[PDB]
Amino acid sequence: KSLDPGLKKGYWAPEEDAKLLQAVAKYGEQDWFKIREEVPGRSDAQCRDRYLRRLHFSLKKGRWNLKEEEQLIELIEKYGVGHWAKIASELPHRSGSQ
DNA sequence: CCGAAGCGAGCACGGTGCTTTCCACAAGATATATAAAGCCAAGAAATCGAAATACTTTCAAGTTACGGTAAGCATAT
């Protein structure tokens, strides 16, 4: 993903809405190397996490209400700290980076 | 019948320090036969060493799911 003349380091999504989302109907969540052969300027390593953090549905999002602190408590009560410990390996999509 | 000229010639040259073709017939050669004994000697049958075309495992190579901080931009005070 470095020293490559064919990659693009942009911030927005120019044509990504069509180049990257078609794979949702084309390929599964495996063998991402088939995607980079058709989408120029994008590498599979960043594309995986982009697809993940963009097309996920089950996330703790919204405004901080009077019922979310209990959610945080029961989240940090499942196995422990969760952010950086090994217990993050079994947390479903609850990665530490978020 | 002697005379001249070749001409062949015995005579000398110092002291020492054998092969094969036949009658001779008198022996030889090739002939069994036990019979114990070990070995040499060539033809099959059993056995084992070298190894190649294959199977396990080791080992290099890149692409894989999963972060570690760090920087540019939106919006509340």
From Swiss-Prot:
Residues 4-59, 60-98 form the HTH myb-type domain. Signal peptide: none annotated. Residues 32-55, 84-98 bind DNA. Coiled coil: none annotated. It comes from the Eukaryota. Changing residue 87 to T: In NEDRSO; uncertain significance. It is found in: Nucleus. Part of the SNAPc complex required for the transcription of both RNA polymerase II and III small-nuclear RNA genes. Binds to the proximal sequence element (PSE), a non-TATA-box basal promoter element common to these 2 types of genes. Recruits TBP and BRF2 to the U6 snRNA TATA box. Part of the SNAPc complex composed of 5 subunits: SNAPC1, SNAPC2, SNAPC3, SNAPC4 and SNAPC5. SNAPC4 interacts with SNAPC1, SNAPC2, SNAPC5, BRF2 and TBP. It is linked to Neurodevelopmental disorder with motor regression, progressive spastic paraplegia, and oromotor dysfunction: An autosomal recessive disorder characterized by delayed motor development and developmental regression after the first year of life, followed by progressive spasticity with gait alterations, paraparesis, and oromotor dysfunction. Most individuals have cerebral, cerebellar, or basal ganglia volume loss. This is snRNA-activating protein complex subunit 4. The gene is SNAPC4.
